[PDB]
Structures are given as structure tokens and as C-alpha cells.
Amino acid sequence: RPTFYRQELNKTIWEVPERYQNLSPVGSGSVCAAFDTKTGLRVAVKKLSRPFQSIIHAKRTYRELRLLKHMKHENVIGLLDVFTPARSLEEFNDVYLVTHLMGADLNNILTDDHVQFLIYQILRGLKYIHSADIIHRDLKPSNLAVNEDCELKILDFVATRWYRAPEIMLNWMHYNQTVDIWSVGCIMAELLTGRTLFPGTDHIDQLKLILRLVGTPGAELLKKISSESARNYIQSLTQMPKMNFANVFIGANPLAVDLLEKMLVLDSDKRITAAQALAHAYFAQYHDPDDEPVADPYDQSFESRDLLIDEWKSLTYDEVISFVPPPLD
Numbered sequence: 001r002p003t004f005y006r007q008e009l010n011k012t013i014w015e016v017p018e019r020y021q022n023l024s025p026v027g028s029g030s031v032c033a034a035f036d037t038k039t040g041l042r043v044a045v046k047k048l049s050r051p052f053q054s055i056i057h058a059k060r061t062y063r064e065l066r067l068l069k070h071m072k073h074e075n076v077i078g079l080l081d082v083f084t085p086a087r088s089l090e091e092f093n094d095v096y097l098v099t100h101l102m103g104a105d106l107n108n109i110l111t112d113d114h115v116q117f118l119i120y121q122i123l124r125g126l127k128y129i130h131s132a133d134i135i136h137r138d139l140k141p142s143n144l145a146v147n148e149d150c151e152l153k154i155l156d157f158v159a160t161r162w163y164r165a166p167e168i169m170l171n172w173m174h175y176n177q178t179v180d181i182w183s184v185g186c187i188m189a190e191l192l193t194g195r196t197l198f199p200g201t202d203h204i205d206q207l208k209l210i211l212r213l214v215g216t217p218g219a220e221l222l223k224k225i226s227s228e229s230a231r232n233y234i235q236s237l238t239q240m241p242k243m244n245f246a247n248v249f250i251g252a253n254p255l256a257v258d259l260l261e262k263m264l265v266l267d268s269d270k271r272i273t274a275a276q277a278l279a280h281a282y283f284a285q286y287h288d289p290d291d292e293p294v295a296d297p298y299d300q301s302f303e304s305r306d307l308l309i310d311e312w313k314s315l316t317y318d319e320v321i322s323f324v325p326p327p328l329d
């Protein structure tokens with residue numbers, strides 16, 4: 001039960017344990033860079049904004065704490081600490097999250113050898129996340145933290161639609177994990193060209209650019225679309241042939257072109273998985289089957305539950321008290 005110290009930083013007040021020093025605002029819940037006197041590391045402290053404001057907020061706060069507490073992988077952001085100034089459930093209102101301070105994002109950043117290492121680390125993190133039955137859904141360069149060492153970590157908290165799989169913008173329920181692989185393809189394409197692959201102005205224009213590259217679907221994909229309106233609209237467009245990816249990505253590593261062909265597929269049933277992609281020949285120099293682990297089981301059953309604010313709040317308090325700090329190395 002450490003001593004807490006308070007200071008007003010920009011808008012809001014901050015009450016943190018003494019071990020975290022030299023708070024410096026970084027963004028805006030609010031996030032401060034600080035120095036961790038227990039480990040000697042630079043860390044990011046995030047103070048959640050109104051974490052229990054509504055049923056939706058309280059469950060969202062609970063969801064975020066559960067996910068971060070579960071992630072233990074080199075290419076996924078991990079939780080160093082979670083704390084509150086409160087001494088009891090009764091006075092519990094503020095939640096603070098502490099993670100490693102990550103240098104920059106992929107947006108702030110390329111050789112073919114850099115793209116291999118960077119995309120290999122994303123796919124390595126996605127295999128872990130997907131093995132827990134978790135879908136990211138929001139992969140984009142600003143959700144990828146990169147070191148000065150080119151070490152990459154997937155994060156979660158430049159248009160989001162540019163990286164979204166086409167099934168999500170068509171509002172298909174029952175999409176699978178490969179919506180993330182579509183995002184990887186869009187990211188890898190941008191690192192190889194310097195240009196956004198699908199800079200759509202909106203959701204309609206986004207699909208137009210996507211289909212111009214991958215083509216309008218064939219009858220094998222059409223016979224699996226349940227929506228009659230979506231099926232008619234797609235069938236009424238002028239048929240566009242699939243462009244040759246070697247032509248579009250001219251001068252790139254033919255192994256990189258072959259992988260993009262397997263990631264940017266309309267039919268998500270045919271799209272390549274993270275595990276399958278890790279064994280693609282394009283990653284021969286980094287791929288190690290004995291060092292690409294999967295995650296412990298993750299209980300998502302709370303997602304289907306409707307509870308009161310105080311109950312999500314109490315479940316969140318439980319997760320704060322039961323937190324075991326990660327081992328120091």
C-alpha cells in the first residue's frame with residue numbers, strides 16, 4: 001500500500017504512487033510519460049476519463065482491464081501496473097494503467113528487409129491474439145508501436161476505413177479473424193509503396209477502390225452472401241477483372257507480392273491466417289516454429305451479460321486487487 005502524491009497536470013488532477021516520477025503529458029483519457037523508480041524504466045501512465053460514467057463506459061473499462069491483464073507476448077502491449085487512489089470499493093472512481101513507454105508508431109516512421117521484420121512481428125502478435133479467440137478489428141499504423149530497434153508491439157486504446165476489411169463495411173455479422181489479415185495486407189502494401197493502398201473518401205468509395213484492385217466477386221463468393229440487397233448491388237456493378245499484383249507492385253520482392261495476393265482476398269474463407277502467413281517463404285529468415293507461441297484461454301463470456309454500473313465497477317475493482325505484477329528481468 002504505497003504512498004500517493006498529487007499534482008495538477010494541464011486539465012486534470014493526478015494521484016499516483018511515489019514510485020512513478022517526472023510526469024510529462026503526452027496525449028489526451030489522459031496519458032503521461034513518467035520514470036518508474038522501481039524498475040528504472042520509462043513508462044506511460046494512462047488515467048481513464050470517467051471510467052464508470054454509464055453502463056457502456058463501465059463495461060468498456062472492465063473489458064480493457066481484462067484484455068491488458070491477459071496479454072503476455074513480446075509483440076503485444078502488456079500491463080506493467082494498474083492502481084487506484086481508493087482504499088475501498090466504496091471510494092473507487094479512478095483507474096490508472098501503466099505500460100512500457102513505446103517510442104513511436106508506424107505512421108511516425110522502408111527497405112524490403114525492414115518490411116519483412118516489421119510485418120513478421122505483427123503476424124507473430126496476431127497469431128497469439130487470434131489463438132485466444134480475440135479479433136483486433138482496428139489494425140492501422142497508429143496502433144503499432146515501434147522501437148528505435150525496430151521492435152514492434154500491437155496496441156489498442158489517418159482514416160480507420162482505409163485498413164478495414166470489406167466485410168466489416170458491408171456490415172456482415174459472422175466475420176472471422178482474417179479481417180485482421182486484411183489490415184496487415186493494407187499496411188504491408190503501404191510500407192512497400194509509401195502510399196495508402198485504399199485511400200477511400202467514405203465507405204462507398206472505399207469499396208470501389210478495393211474492387212478495382214481485387215475485382216468483382218465470382219459466383220463462388222456470391223452464392224455465400226446472405227443479404228439479398230447486398231447481393232443485387234454487387235451483381236449490378238460493372239464487372240471488373242482482378243488486377244495482376246505483379247503489375248501493381250512492380251519492382252517488389254516477388255515473395256512479398258505473392259503474400260499480398262493471399263492476404264487481399266475478397267472471400268474471407270480463402271484468406272490466409274496469421275499462422276499460415278508466418279510459414280510463408282517471405283519470412284524464411286525470421287520464422288521459427290518453436291518460438292511463435294499461443295495464448296492461454298480467455299474468458300469472453302462477460303460480453304453477453306447485461307449488468308448494472310455498480311456490478312461492472314465491482315468486477316473492475318476485483319481485477320485491480322488481484323493484479324500480479326509481471327516479473328522483473
Ligand SMILES: Nc1ccc2c(NCc3cccs3)nc(-c3ccccc3)nc2c1
Binds near residue numbers: 170171172226267
Ligand atoms: N463467406 C463469405 C465471404 C465473404 C463475404 C462477404 N464479403 C464481402 C464482399 C463480397 C463481395 C463484394 S464485397 N460479404 C458477405 C456479406 C454477407 C451479408 C451481407 C453483406 C456481406 N458475406 C461473405 C461471406
